[PDB]
Amino acid sequence: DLSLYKQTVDLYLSIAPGHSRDPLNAIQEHMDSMILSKLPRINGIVLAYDNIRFLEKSAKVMYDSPFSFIWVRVDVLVFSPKKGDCLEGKINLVSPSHIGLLILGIFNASIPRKSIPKDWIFIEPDTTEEQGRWKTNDGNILEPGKDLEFVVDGQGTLAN
Amino acid sequence: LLLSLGVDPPSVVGHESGWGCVQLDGKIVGWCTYKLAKHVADVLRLMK
Amino acid sequence: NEYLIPSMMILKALLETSDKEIFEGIVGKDLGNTFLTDRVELMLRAYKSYGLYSQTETLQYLGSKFRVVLGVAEDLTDVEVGRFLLQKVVLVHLREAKDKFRLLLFMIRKLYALVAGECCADNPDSPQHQEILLGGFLYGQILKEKIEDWLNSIRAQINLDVRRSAPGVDFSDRKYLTRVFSKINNDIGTKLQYFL
Amino acid sequence: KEIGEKCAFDSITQEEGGALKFGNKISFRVDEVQIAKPMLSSRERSSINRKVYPAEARERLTTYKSRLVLKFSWSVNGGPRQSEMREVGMIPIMVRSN
């Protein structure tokens, strides 16, 4: 669905003293650290950030730390999969205890057989024991059906 | 090839004094005098 | 265990053969070769001393004599036990009993020739009379051995399953087969790894 | 194949019968042996289930084994002889081999 989110947040950034010539320098310096790392304040993973502008306060310096602090406004791109609704992924590993899916080619999904309706069955091949087809109740085979659509619980669910 | 070559497996005893036995890895297939034996050997390796 | 059964016994048991057929196969040549003739006669006579005549009687006698060390199906019959022997031990490389018989003839013939110095002693202590064992081959052989012990173990489990009183006795329910499959130890790969 | 098959049943003592009867006879045998490649510790671990090259088995100091499958066949003293695969463990594999 529309699981993508962009949110302009305001943070209390710690400007190093050596980058006193330009704050934007040290701002992006650690801003490149937040990317792809979960911002727990919003409980999502940083995907993009722009509009690096500070509420101009000529940052107040700590009482005993030379690196100062200031409030800055930036616009994050967190992706919130908070068990909202139907999402979809490409299956990468398939074995009759859980299914491994990739959402957006990055994030992982382990839908266990219990959250899967019992009616679907697995075939355990000859070349591979576990790398095989969790053929659905319908009999439709799932590997070439690389995309699987499902609902999220937090972690996935196939039971209807 | 052995049958076409001068030996034969008998049913009732096709065996006499100067006749030698030929063995295919533990299976009697025929008999021939030793001259025929050596000649068969030579021609067979030659075919091989 | 070593086991010694008279050659003449297994001979007449192998093929529905007349003793004249034996004699004319063993030494049929140069009619009246002294040594071969008198020895062969003694052999036929010493077996005749106690033995039986037709092939089936000897087959049944053999089966009834050897049904124990055989792990064969206990219930079926007795003459098929003898055929089991004749197929399973005597000359396993061969399959046609008449051909086995011809070769046994050739073999005892060569043996007698060796008795009278008519042939030099083969040297087993020479790479002439010798071949090599590989790894994969012995690997397959021991593997087959464990296969068979596994089959015999699961058969034994089904047997004791019947034997207790009748805990579960239904050779038609796949559930029962699942239960007994779990009942036996279903790992052998560790056995081969163990040996290696 | 040259192993054959094994029988089991309920033996009723003959007791002068001579043909000690038995009905529920099962004769089972393995149809074939399946040796697959040594997959990665087969049971899924939420990763791309790949293979294990022997170098790794050297490193982790572990034997180099691959699953072993039998094709078990039945008989209910009729003609059912349906099949099923039984894993009987994992056995080693030699380097560079087939």
UniProtKB/Swiss-Prot annotation, chain A:
Family matches, as Pfam families: RPA43_OB (PF17875), SHS2_Rpb7-N (PF03876)
Please name the GO terms of the biological process aspect recorded for this protein, alphabetically: transcription elongation by RNA polymerase I; transcription initiation at RNA polymerase I promoter
Chief subcellular location equals nucleus
Compartment annotation: Nucleus, Nucleolus
- Supply the alphabetized keyword list: DNA-directed RNA polymerase, Nucleus, Phosphoprotein, Transcription
Q: How is it modified after translation?
A: Contains an average of four phosphates per molecule.
InterPro entries from the UniProt entry: RNA_pol_Rpb7-like_N_sf, RPA43_OB, Rpb7-like, Rpb7-like_N
Taxonomically, which superkingdom? Eukaryota
Q: Does the keyword Transcription apply?
A: yes
Q: Does the keyword Iron apply?
A: no
Q: Which GO terms describe its cellular component?
A: cytosol; nucleolus; nucleus; RNA polymerase I complex
Question: Partners and quaternary state?
Answer: Component of the RNA polymerase I (Pol I) complex consisting of 14 subunits. Part of a Pol I subcomplex consisting of the subunits A14 and A43. Interacts with ker1/A14.
Query: What exactly does this protein do?
Result: DNA-dependent RNA polymerase catalyzes the transcription of DNA into RNA using the four ribonucleoside triphosphates as substrates. Component of RNA polymerase I which synthesizes ribosomal RNA precursors. May be involved in recruitment of Pol I to rDNA promoters.
UniProt similarity note: Belongs to the eukaryotic RPA43 RNA polymerase subunit family.
Question: What protein is this chain from?
Answer: DNA-directed RNA polymerase I subunit rpa43
Its organism's taxonomic lineage begins at: Eukaryota, Fungi, Dikarya, Ascomycota, Taphrinomycotina
This protein's gene is called: rpa43
Swiss-Prot record, chain C:
Annotated compartments: Nucleus, Nucleolus
Binding partners and assembly: Component of the RNA polymerase I (Pol I) complex consisting of 14 subunits.
Q: Which family does it belong to?
A: Belongs to the RNA polymerase beta chain family.
What is the annotated role of this protein in its UniProt record? Answer: DNA-dependent RNA polymerase catalyzes the transcription of DNA into RNA using the four ribonucleoside triphosphates as substrates. Second largest core component of RNA polymerase I which synthesizes ribosomal RNA precursors. Proposed to contribute to the polymerase catalytic activity and forms the polymerase active center together with the largest subunit. Pol I is composed of mobile elements and RPA2 is part of the core element with the central large cleft and probably a clamp element that moves to open and close the cleft.
Protein name (database record): Probable DNA-directed RNA polymerase I subunit RPA2
What species does this protein belong to?
Answer: Schizosaccharomyces pombe (strain 972 / ATCC 24843)
Range covered out of full length: 246 to 441 of 1174
